[PDB]
Amino acid sequence: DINVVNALAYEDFVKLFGNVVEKCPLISAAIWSYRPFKDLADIEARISEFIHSLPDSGKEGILRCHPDLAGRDLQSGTLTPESQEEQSQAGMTTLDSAEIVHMYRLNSEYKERFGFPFVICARLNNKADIVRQLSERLKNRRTAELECAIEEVKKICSLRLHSI
Amino acid sequence: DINVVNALAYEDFVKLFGNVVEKCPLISAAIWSYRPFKDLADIEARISEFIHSLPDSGKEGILRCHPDLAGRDLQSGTLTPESQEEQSQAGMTTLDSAEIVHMYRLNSEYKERFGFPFVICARLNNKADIVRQLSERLKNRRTAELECAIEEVKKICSLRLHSIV
Ligand SMILES: NC(=O)NC1=NC(=O)NC1=O
Numbered sequence: 001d002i003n004v005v006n007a008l009a010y011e012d013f014v015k016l017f018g019n020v021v022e023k024c025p026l027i028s029a030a031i032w033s034y035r036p037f038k039d040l041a042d043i044e045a046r047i048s049e050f051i052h053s054l055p056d057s058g059k060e061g062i063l064r065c066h067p068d069l070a071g072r073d074l075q076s077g078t079l080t081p082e083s084q085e086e087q088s089q090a091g092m093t094t095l096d097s098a099e100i101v102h103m104y105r106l107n108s109e110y111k112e113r114f115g116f117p118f119v120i121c122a123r124l125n126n127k128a129d130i131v132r133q134l135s136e137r138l139k140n141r142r143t144a145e146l147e148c149a150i151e152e153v154k155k156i157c158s159l160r161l162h163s164i
Numbered sequence: 165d166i167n168v169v170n171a172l173a174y175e176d177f178v179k180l181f182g183n184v185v186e187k188c189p190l191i192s193a194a195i196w197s198y199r200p201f202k203d204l205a206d207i208e209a210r211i212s213e214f215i216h217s218l219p220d221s222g223k224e225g226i227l228r229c230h231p232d233l234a235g236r237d238l239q240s241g242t243l244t245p246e247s248q249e250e251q252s253q254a255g256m257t258t259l260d261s262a263e264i265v266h267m268y269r270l271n272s273e274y275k276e277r278f279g280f281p282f283v284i285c286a287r288l289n290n291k292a293d294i295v296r297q298l299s300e301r302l303k304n305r306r307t308a309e310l311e312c313a314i315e316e317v318k319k320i321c322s323l324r325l326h327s328i329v
């Protein structure tokens with residue numbers, strides 16, 4: 001109900017919406033300045049607007065706040081609830097030994113090339129789609145890759161918003 | 165040693181510097197793009213420039229990521245390590261029921277006016293300085309108070325950085 005949302009104290013707005021962009025509560029905290037909102041779509045547009053106003057370093061910074069698919073945080077039970085649910089949905093929690101070594105290998109190569117983690121919208125992809133895109137995006141130039149990765153962040157955000 | 169900082173992987177850099185601006189690891193994460201850093205001052209300068217590049221809503225957003233002095237989080241024991249140590253040094257951890265209630269009311273008035281928390285460098289202020297700044301800054305215009313608050317955020321960041329050092 002956009003009306004209860006629009007009436008939220010900023011503290012409560014940030015508590016509810018503070019993880020729609022992984023570990024970046026600043027983003028949701030920022031867009032509260034633009035209340036009242038017309039609908040959830042208004043909130044989405046404001047968030048996209050904010051992200052796109054950032055320098056490239058800010059975009060890369062957002063990416064660096066994300067945990068690896070099937071990486072240290074998954075295997076340590078230190079993912080946020082959203083990341084944990086999303087990664088299980090994409091099959092990351094039931095990878096076999098060979099699949100885990102492969103994901104490690106693919107992640108290391110990606111981060112070495114680009115200087116941020118590989119990010120994809122897990123809820124929109126299965127295991128196979130994920131390996132396909134990783135191998136694919138590995139071949140991108142940095143500028144094109146940054147745009148690609150931020151689009152996945154925005155998709156993740158939209159789904160997270162709609163799960164609230 | 166800046167050489168060692170300059171050699172950190174972003175995962176390690178974010179882990180170590182991710183809380184120099186409260187609950188805003190994004191800023192630490194962003195500035196890693198500009199490495200190598202000449203010195204600590206280059207780091208602070210990149211932080212400052214990043215913050216200054218944000219829209220006003222981003223600056224407000226940063227402030228909104230800070231907990232209240234003596235507030236729910238302190239009482240619940242759910243502050244970040246730095247905030248916890250910083251409020252204890254400013255005398256927020258040994259307040260009686262009266263004072264806790266009084267801090268709550270001052271914070272309520274400020275945040276109702278400005279639409280973000282009252283932020284002060286706690287490691288440079290005692291409990292009486294805190295109440296005094298709270299009352300003076302309540303009079304500021306919103307435009308001015310935003311810049312004043314952000315300066316305090318930069319002060320906190322500088323001392324967090326030097327504590328890491
Ligand atoms: N791809 C990632 O880097 N992280 C994952 N994508 C999601 O949507 N959730 C995650 O945990």
Ligand SMILES: NC(=O)NC1=NC(=O)NC1=O
Pocket residue numbers: 230231232233246247248250251281282283284285286287320
């Ligand atoms: N003033 C605040 O809003 N927060 C406090 N100032 C600090 O320096 N540390 C805090 O926890």
